[model samples]
Target chain A: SRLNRESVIDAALELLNETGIDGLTTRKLAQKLGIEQPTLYWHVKNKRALLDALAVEILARHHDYSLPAAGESWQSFLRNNAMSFRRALLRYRDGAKVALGTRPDEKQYDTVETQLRFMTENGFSLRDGLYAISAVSHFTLGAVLEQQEHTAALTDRPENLPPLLREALQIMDSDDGEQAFLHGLESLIRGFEVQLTALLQIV
Target chain B: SRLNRESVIDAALELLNETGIDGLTTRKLAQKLGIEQPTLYWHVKNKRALLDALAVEILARHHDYSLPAAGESWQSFLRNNAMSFRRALLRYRDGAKVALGTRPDEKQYDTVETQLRFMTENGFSLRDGLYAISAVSHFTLGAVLEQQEHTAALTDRPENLPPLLREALQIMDSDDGEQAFLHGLESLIRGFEVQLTALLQIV
Candidate 1:
């Protein structure tokens, strides 16, 4: 009863680190905290509300999304944003999936504003800046799921696939997917660099 | 007392089409077929086996994985393969995820050989062609999931996102993300062209 939302969140994360997200339940958390289930609701409204709360707090803990005031290249601007996301998600088991484009109202708005600011500063028109952000977000989400499956699915079958897939399985076998991810991200940035001039003229 | 394997498959697919994968069960399927549950065991194995059989059959549909003889470019060759896989999955809900990089049999082999043939014609090395094919397939799976989420997720309001998501969502929200998928796919292909040439000359 004495513990506020912060202590409740601390308890939940302790449970999460031990049991994982799927294993965490409100009843279990209450039992762990020696309180009634409804008592836990005082800090976090429900399961979804709890996830949103935990995610924002966790991401904010690691990175504040701040960039230097002075100028940097557009590619540098874009790369920093991508690395910030990658590092945050690489912490938990399914952190990337958990953080995939979650837009709950309770989350701090200034984080989103940083993305909007970064894109606009890198020579994107207001509309294109927004579109580029969306593209990167979904692209990262789509890419990260496959990478997540690499861990979650837990079944490796190089022998099962044909020769080509077998080769792919071996070549992409390591944690080098970050390199693959960055390669793809860089391609998108390159495409943006080429498109920005044309786009500015059109806008 | 006696039903063939094919009839059981038809029943499974019928069940899948009527209700999604989650509702599918051996007992329910037996009831749908007007057969006893134990009798159902006589024809097929468990539900996953039945699902895998349906998946294999989905691949063995009247799909031609043959490469173009001479006129088609690598882009066309790649598009053809991606579309073939998509059409197979569209035949059943939750099918692509089921068949993602699954064990390749004869049909799968033929498909990849065709892909290799195209790459060879387009001047790709043995390893490079294979890598390109794998990357394209990964894109295909990612694109399919994004398209499926349109029908699956409850509310896909582009307006819910900030102004940044508007353009990307406009591209995705209009006409079922086909254009956006193609745009991203074309960008990958362009990048692949550059990277593949660079890889070939290296050795």
Candidate 2:
């Protein structure tokens, strides 16, 4: 079968869900593709390169809110952007690990530049805007990393467990972690709002 | 050399710095310890068990501010706790990754319970307190994971880069990511403060 970059990446992503990052091997990937290792190498130089491509493609394919819509507030854009990013990373096993291991591709420079400009237009200094954006990304990455790594249910609560902890765990067990994620996301955004207000007051 | 749990874990951690998580193997660990694989198994059942033990030990050894200091405010305690947690995760290569792959040990329940109780004593409801703690943790984990994974310096600036992004990159290159992390941390914490205040006003 003829293989293109897109097809190669698609196959790799499917395999990722099956084997995860550590389990993903070029030898296995070649076997799955029904091609020689050399043939696979022609498309992607190495596992590292393949992973880098996967990182970018993951976002390009699933993160739909990289930019704000028309007349969207910075707060709304940021919040939506984080949610989209979290969803994208949650799409595959070890997706956050893949993302953390790779740097942003040059293809994203334009989008990121636009994002930074949008934040500036909306009253954030370039540094602060970068901070806000990085914070959201970092928080989302951490949240998804933890979510993906540890998905076990709290089955048995120790009788000696403190009341507050038992309650917290019970609540955690009942929900799918969305409530906590949103709460944190909102707090981060609201914190930015407070910072923006202070800057305005100073001006 | 005599084998014990503490010495085995210490050796594994040293190997972790040398080869990272994927490279860490029981075979290598046993070789490093001058013991047979079966002998090592007596101490740690497998690589997964070793990692779980490492994750708990990393925090136990390095995270200093797990509980509030005497007479410390909840805000101060959280800030200090986050900073300490960040430092602990940053201590080794793939440290954040190790932390993410493991769950809170049974040994940590007491510490975690005390933490929840401290937050409740301060003013937060059990759920909100959990959310706040989780947000701080998630954000910090994300920050550290990125930091450990991508420590390369931004040496080149594309000439065609937009002014704002150029400036942002320059600032980022000049600093070691602390400023951005602190800024985000403050924002998340301040956001919680705002939420708490709103709740108070409602009451």
Candidate 3:
């Protein structure tokens, strides 16, 4: 069987779904690839390196709206990009955990450069643009991390709970997570718009 | 030394600072406490239980602003709470990772109930209040997770980067993370204010 960087990462991702981040090991990855440890080491030196590659690959493969469409507003682009990023992180078991704090691969430099350019052209200073981009990314990461880690059944509803909390839990129970995500995302985007509007007025 | 739930969790937190989440083991914790594995098991059944207790304790010990002060506005409370939460998560090694997806401890119900009541009194519905609280939490978790995991110094600045990205990186290089965090936090709070204002107008 032939092996390459791409194939190794694909196999590692498969193993990740089976065992999660804590369970992922280089030995297990090598075994899954039908390759020896030395051969696997030539491609990825250790679990950390393998995880870094997988993190980048997961985004490259699953994040479809990394760049804005032609003529899309910065607000729309941010909202779309956030949703896309969230879906990508939710694709695998512990995917958000895998992606957390991994450095952006050099391959992503151009994509991010372009996104920053769009923001600057549309009234955001480079610093503010980066903050906005980071805010969306961080919010999405946090959301997915919680969803993946704690999707267990919400049993044991205590009837003695406070009325407001009980009512809130009922509303929460009906949600499939999409509502809260959208609501928060909209709020974030609107907040950025307010900042942009003020900046534009000053100019 | 006598072992109780509080003392056991205290020792586990010390172990966590030394070993981090992945390196933390029941065996290691038992060894640290100078107790047998079976004895430690009586207090915490497994790594999972230990982590749940630790997560709750991390917040309880360090997150000082979990509840708002008397006459504190919703916006002020949210901001202070978020800053406090971020600091707590930054206190220990992998603290954010430790807290990720852990259920709110049963003891936190009263605190959260008070928070929700304050928000509802200030103009937010229970649903919106939950969304607001969750956004601040998720955003803070994501921020702390990134900060804790990737506080490495930025080196090897490639001079070939495009103009905007290069400028953005320079600004980012100067920031110690506090700037970006505050910027994003304000935007989120302002966004919520926008929503609340609209709701008030409609009433």
Judging by DockQ against the true structure, name the best candidate.
2
Ranking by lDDT: 2, 3, 1
DockQ of 3: 0.54
Candidate 2 residues lying further than 4 Å off, grouped into runs, are A152-160, A200-203, B152-160, B200-203
Candidate 3 residue lDDT tens string, A1-203 = 45787888889899998888887898888889888999878887767677678889999899999999999999999999999999999888889988877555778889988999899899888888899998998888898887777762132121568887888778766875678888898888888888878864741
Question: Which order, best to worst by DockQ?
Answer: 2, 3, 1
Candidate that beats the other on TM-score, 2 or 3, i.e. the better one = 2
lDDT of 1 by residue, A1-203 (tens): 35687777777777765665555678878887899877777766655656666667567666444353457776676677666766666666555444543553435554566556667777776556654554555555555555665554344322346664566456667554675677666655665655676663742
Give the TM-score between model 3's chain B and the true chain B: 0.89
lDDT of each: 0.61, 0.85, 0.83
Instruction: Specify the CAPRI tier of model 3.
Output: medium
Provide per-model DockQ scores: 0.21, 0.62, 0.54
Model 2 over residues B1-203: C-alpha lDDT tens digits?
A: 66788898899999998888887999999998999989888887767777788899999899998999899998899899999999998888788888883545789988999999999898999899999999999999999888777662122121667777778878876876778899899999989998987885741
Sorted by TM-score (best first), the order is 2, 3, 1
Give me the TM-scores for chain A across all models, comma-separated: 0.83, 0.91, 0.90
Best-matching candidate per lDDT: 2
What iRMS does model 1 reach? 4.3
What is the Å distance of residue B91 in model 1 from its true position? Answer: 5.7
